[PDB]
Amino acid sequence: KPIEIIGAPFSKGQPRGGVEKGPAALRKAGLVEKLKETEYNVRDHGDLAFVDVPNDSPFQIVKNPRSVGKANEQLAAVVAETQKNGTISVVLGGDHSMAIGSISGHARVHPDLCVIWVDAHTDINTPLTTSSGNLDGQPVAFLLKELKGKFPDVPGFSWVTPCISAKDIVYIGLRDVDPGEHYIIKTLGIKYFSMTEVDKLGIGKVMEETFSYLLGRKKRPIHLSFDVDGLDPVFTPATGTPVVGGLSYREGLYITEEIYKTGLLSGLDIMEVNPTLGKTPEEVTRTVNTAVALTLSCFGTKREGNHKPETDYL
């Protein structure tokens, strides 16, 4: 099965300039060459060039709405096409607002997909409930059917069409939710495993339930949107919104080793790596290294080892 990488060096969903240098640090760490070592074929589409929208006034409280919308509508066109040619898309970005295009474009081709959203945040604030004008906590509000017509249309997102329902997404690692967001997840009946649920069941029992929830009835493609801040700041410090008490390096890997075993991984997101926020060089390398290990695990690199087939090593 083919794998195609797509760079999304975009950072208008957040105050923090810097995340536009993420695909570059990842690529700079051997991400593309290591992928060729698996049993997959890798092609580097290359970074996208988002055309800046001038005089992009703020919509009420939301910042850079049109720049984020047009830049997203663009990832959408690229993902759908690559999905079209039966290939797995791996988007290296930028802040998490790029999940609007990455997930919608994926659903155009595979409308029966489900979403595993590993994050310390629910990123489900609507244009109204936000305390900031930051779109990095709103992507999911633009993707859910149940949330359509619940908030005024944001200039730049009329091309989006809520594709997945609150029932086709699962949250993993939550530990920082806004009163608004929590009220939404409780009202919509969204399946989630916050840090306390993970403490109770153990990552193993968790992954084993999300699969019988999403894949229980009918097997379907899986979209894996990974926000580096789902892991504790000790492993992935280079993120703009780190929160203590996160998933560990080991649990991080476990989620990706299990999602591979399903043979359903259709789309992948590695968001929020900001190389300019590592207080010291050590921190960044740490964030980039664990980010590369998560991507490799989604495509075969297991912790027990790996020996090429039809080969007798003796």
Residues interacting with a copy of itself, by CB under 8 A? Answer: 122, 126, 128-129, 150-151, 174-175, 177-187, 192, 194-197, 199-204, 235, 244-245, 248-251, 253-254, 257, 289-290, 302-308, 311-314
**Centroid of chain to Cα 95:** 9
Query: Residue by residue, what is the 3-state secondary structure of 107-145?
Result: HHHCCCCEEEEECCCCCCCCCCCCCCCCHHHCHHHHHEH
Q: Which is nearer to a copy of itself, 232 or 272 (CB)?
A: 232
Residues facing 267 on adjacent strands: 89, 223
Contact between 121 and Mn ion (CB under 5 A)? yes
Q: How close are the terminal C-alpha atoms of the chain, in Å?
A: 29
Ligand-binding site membership of 124 (annotated): yes
Please report how close the Cβ of residue 101 comes to a copy of itself at its closest, in angstroms: 24
Q: Does 123 sit near Mn ion (CB under 5 A)?
A: yes
Of the two residues 20 and 229, which places its CB atom closer to a copy of itself in the complex? Answer: 229
The set of residues, in sequence order, having a beta carbon less than 8 Å from that of 147 and lying 6+ positions away, is 126, 141, 162, 184, 188
Q: Could you tell which of Mn ion, a copy of itself, none binds residue 96, using a CB distance below 5 to 8 A set by kind?
A: Mn ion
132 annotated to bind ligand: yes
Q: Decide which of a copy of itself, Mn ion, none touches 303; Cβ closer than 5 to 8 Å per partner kind.
A: a copy of itself
Q: How far is CA 131 from CA 36, 75, 137, 184, in A?
A: 43, 27, 10, 15
- Count residues near Mn ion (CB under 5 A): 6
Partner in contact with 261, chosen from a copy of itself, Mn ion, none, beta carbon below 5 to 8 Å by kind: none
Of the pair 83, 295, the CB lying nearest a copy of itself is at 295
Q: Are 210 and 173 in contact (CB under 8 A)?
A: no
- At its nearest, how many Å lie between a copy of itself and the CB of residue 205? 9
- What whole-number distance in Å separates Cα of residue 311 and Cα of residue 167? 44
The residues pairing with 59 across neighbouring beta strands, listed in sequence order, are: 62
Pairing of strands 88-92, 41-47: unpaired
250 contact, one of a copy of itself, Mn ion, none, CB 5-8 Å limit per kind: a copy of itself
Identify the residue among 20, 47, 168, 229 touching Mn ion (CB under 5 A).
Answer: 229
Contacts with Mn ion, residue ranges (CB under 5 A): 96, 119, 121, 123, 227, 229
